[PDB]
Design a protein around this ligand. Structure first.
Ligand SMILES: O=C(N[C@H]1COC(=O)[C@@H](NC(=O)c2cccc(O)c2O)COC(=O)[C@@H](NC(=O)c2cccc(O)c2O)COC1=O)c1cccc(O)c1O
Ligand SMILES: [Fe+3]
Ligand code: NA
Length: 174
């Protein structure tokens, strides 16, 4: 298994004055880029949603919902606030076989339309990283998508490591 190296954290900006309350709610994964992400023309990635909800202790309950095998899988996890506002770590890391590290960093967002979030996970000693282009609606402007392509490339990812999930109506609505 050969992976493109995770970028130095210096090359990943941080959203200034992060408003955790405003980042709550459903986001659509309109763009996906990473060293473990591949473009598949035979079976193109279907769009999925990720809901963020602040608890009393100000950690997130991050629930992903995707359409797979004719059903709807619910992938739940907790983001604990990290070193800075916008940065998070994965709660209950011990419950994931092999996972020794997990970082999340909100690169940029306007809270009501779009967001770019940088993730980085060390599982089985393999360093994985990804950037998701969150959209409040299923569609986003060409500028925002080209900006996401530009940023992904600045972290060493080529074109075939950047996919744009196709919009669907199954389960990501509601
Ligand atoms: O590129 C990343 N993974 C690869 C796979 O590589 C990994 O990092 C492994 N897995 C975790 O380490 C992980 C442990 C505990 C919690 C995790 O979220 C883990 O990812 C393998 O399993 C998976 O995560 C599987 N995928 C989901 O379950 C998923 C489905 C929908 C939505 C998802 O978010 C999913 O993870 C297989 O596909 C992947 O997405 C990747 C990198 C950096 C940060 C990531 O979060 C990545 O996911
Ligand atoms: Fe993941
Ligand atoms: Na993924």
């Amino acid at each position: 298994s050969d992976l493109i190296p995770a970028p130095p954290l210096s090359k990943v900006p941080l959203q200034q004055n992060f408003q955790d309350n405003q980042f709550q709610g459903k986001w659509y994964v309109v763009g996906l880029a990473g060293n473990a992400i591949l473009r598949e023309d035979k079976d193109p990635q279907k769009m999925y949603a990720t809901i963020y909800e602040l608890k009393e202790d100000k950690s997130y309950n991050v629930t992903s919902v995707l359409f797979r095998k004719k059903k709807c899988d619910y992938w739940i996890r907790t983001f604990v606030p990290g070193s800075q506002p916008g940065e998070f770590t994965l709660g209950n890391i011990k419950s994931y076989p092999g996972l020794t590290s997990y970082l999340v960093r909100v690169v940029s967002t306007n809270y009501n339309q779009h967001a770019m979030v940088f993730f980085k996970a060390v599982s089985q000693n393999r360093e994985y990283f990804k950037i998701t282009l969150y959209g409040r609606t299923k569609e986003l402007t060409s500028e925002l998508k080209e900006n996401f392509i530009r940023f992904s490339k600045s972290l060493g990812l080529p074109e075939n490591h950047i996919v744009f999930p196709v919009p669907i109506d199954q389960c990501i609505d509601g």
